[PDB]
Design a protein around this ligand. Structure first.
Ligand SMILES: COc1ccc(Cl)cc1C[C@@H]1CN/C(=N\N(C)C)CN(CC(=O)Nc2cccc(S(C)(=O)=O)c2)C1=O
Ligand SMILES: [Cl-]
Ligand SMILES: [Cl-]
Length: 224
């Protein structure tokens, strides 16, 4: 996360981290006791899922392994369209005040809405600095045609853009798959953008969750 601050302790109970070894791979969210939503480009054979602390490596934290994950059937490795994936935890997460489900959207929030993006990703770009504290940055949803000005043909209508004008505020490496919430529901999963991170007027690009609730719910039911 670029030009952000540590997230208020206990306000991202639905945030999880995906680790390979004890080392960060992606961000993600908890849909419920059994399942994690992240980006399809975070796909690995096995995952260790960090839960229940803004602090990475905490003693209080829960780590649960996951051996199965299912990317969206329509994901492209070339274009990163439909960049979303479900991760099935080997055992159920134990909810607490520190472990909650994300409120999935029943609505696509419109351009200009204030949103928060969070992660443990590099706090700097190109030179990298990884924080144990979960980091937050507030951004606004940018409209599709506004974003297309910048990204042209790379953009699908299932991808959502967010940033602040003339601002370095954005997500970066390691923030991948992590949440963008706006008015209390999950609106984005961190997918792609430009390098180095935080170039002003280069919006961060998100997978637009409100377009995929049906696949999400159907996949959870499928693998009951
Ligand atoms: C320049 O990077 C970005 C620019 C804008 C935005 Cl919004 C996000 C990012 C972070 C990216 C997003 N997208 C990625 N691939 N796309 C599907 C094209 C790559 N990605 C994964 C990643 O690099 N993860 C990572 C995790 C832990 C450590 C490192 S490292 C080796 O760079 O230190 C990297 C990322 O994390
Ligand atoms: Cl798969
Ligand atoms: Cl169980």
């Amino acid at each position: 996360i670029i030009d952000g601050a540590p997230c208020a302790r206990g306000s991202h109970p639905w945030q999880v981290a995906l680790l390979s070894g004890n080392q960060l791979h992606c961000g993600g969210v908890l849909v419920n006791e059994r399942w994690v939503l992240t980006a399809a480009h975070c796909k690995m054979n096995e995952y260790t899922v960090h839960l229940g602390s803004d602090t990475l490596g905490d003693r209080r934290a829960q780590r649960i392994k996951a051996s199965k994950s299912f990317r969206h059937p329509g994901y492209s490795t070339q274009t990163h369209v439909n960049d979303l994936m479900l991760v099935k935890l080997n055992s159920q997460a134990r909810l607490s005040s520190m472990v909650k489900k994300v409120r999935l959207p029943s609505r696509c929030e419109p351009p200009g809405t204030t949103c928060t993006v969070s992660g443990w990703g590099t706090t700097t770009s190109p030179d990298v600095t990884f924080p144990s504290d979960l980091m937050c940055v507030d951004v606004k949803l940018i409209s599709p045609q506004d974003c297309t000005k910048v990204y042209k043909d790379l953009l699908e209508n299932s991808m959502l853009c967010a940033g602040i004008p003339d601002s370095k505020k954005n997500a970066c490496n390691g923030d991948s798959g992590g949440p963008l919430v706006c008015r209390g529901t999950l609106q984005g999963l961190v997918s792609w953008g430009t390098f180095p991170c935080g170039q002003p007027n280069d919006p961060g690009v998100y997978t637009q969750v409100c377009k995929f609730t049906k696949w999400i719910n159907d996949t959870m039911k499928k693998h009951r």
